[PDB]
Structure formats: structure tokens, C-alpha cells
């Protein structure tokens, strides 16, 4: 009943969201930082390949590895495909205003085809056509 983070969660549970955003931000982020540091520390001491490990170590690693997974912004990370295939201050973009809002004038007058949320939409030879898992699963089987 004296740990800095063990009272933070309790006081958040009791008081609730009656305070401003920053206090809730810090109170939630403390435990996240602690968890990431612990998991990274355990992972460092390990080996890489799974053919050189015992049973208990393999189970521990496979259980605790998954907390580093990310799902939403993979494409932005991976776009850096351009090097494998070949061999911007918002204003130059079309369909986006300076305040990161949609520009209706161009999209309604000039008949803009698509909106370049990210780079690589200018010109483009990397394709990357959207798919559906179930169609592929039926196709294979």
C-alpha cells in the first residue's frame, strides 16, 4: 500500500475521471512503462532461434512475446518496398488542407480521382491491391 503505481490505480478507480486529462495520462502510463521494461529485459537474455532452447524457456518466451504486437500502422512503417521495387509539407498534397481537413473545392471542381493520405501515391508502381482473407482461404482450398 505504498508503491507509487499501486496507489495510482486505486486513486484512479475511486476518483474517476473528475480531473483533467494529464493526470489520467501519467497514472495510466506508469504501469505501461513498467511492463514494457520488464518484458524487454527478459527478452534480452534469451536466444534467438527456437531450436537451441529448453521447453520452459520456449513457453515463457512465446507467452510473453506477444505484448509487443502492433496492428494499425504497419503499412506506414513498411512503405520504406520502394527500395525493393525501384532497383511534402501537406500543401503539396491534394485533398488535404493546411489544418489537416478535407478540401472540398478541388474534390468537387477538378474531379480528383483519389486522396493521397501517405506518400507513394504520387506516381506509383508498387500496386498493393487490397484483399480479403476469406476469399483467399476459399481459393487455396
Amino acid at each position: 500500500m505504498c508503491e507509487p503505481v499501486s496507489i495510482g490505480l486505486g486513486i484512479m478507480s475511486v476518483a474517476g475521471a473528475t480531473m483533467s486529462a494529464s493526470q489520467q495520462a501519467k497514472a495510466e502510463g506508469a504501469a505501461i512503462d513498467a511492463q514494457n521494461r520488464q518484458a524487454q529485459e527478459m527478452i534480452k537474455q534469451m536466444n534467438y532461434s527456437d531450436a537451441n532452447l529448453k521447453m520452459q524457456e520456449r513457453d515463457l518466451k512465446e507467452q510473453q512475446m506477444a505484448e509487443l504486437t502492433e496492428t494499425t500502422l504497419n503499412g506506414i512503417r513498411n512503405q520504406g518496398v520502394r527500395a525493393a521495387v525501384a532497383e511534402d509539407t501537406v500543401k503539396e498534397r491534394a485533398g488535404i488542407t493546411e489544418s489537416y481537413n478535407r478540401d472540398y473545392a478541388a474534390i468537387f471542381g477538378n474531379r480528383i480521382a483519389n486522396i493521397e493520405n501517405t506518400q507513394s501515391a504520387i506516381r506509383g508502381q508498387g500496386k498493393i491491391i487490397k484483399t480479403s482473407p476469406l476469399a483467399h482461404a476459399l481459393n487455396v482450398a
Binding site: 494499425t72 503499412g75 483519389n114 486522396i115 501517405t118 501515391a121
Partner: peptide, 17 residues
């Protein structure tokens, strides 16, 4: 609720008149 998030798109297609 919130079954699964929606991945961010590279670029999006629209239409006009």
C-alpha cells in the same frame, strides 16, 4: 463492443458528379 479496429489506409477512392 469494439470487435476489432480498422487498419489505416494507404490511399482512398472517391467519386464525383
Amino acid at each position: 463492443s469494439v470487435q476489432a479496429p480498422e487498419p489505416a489506409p494507404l490511399s482512398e477512392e472517391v467519386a464525383s458528379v
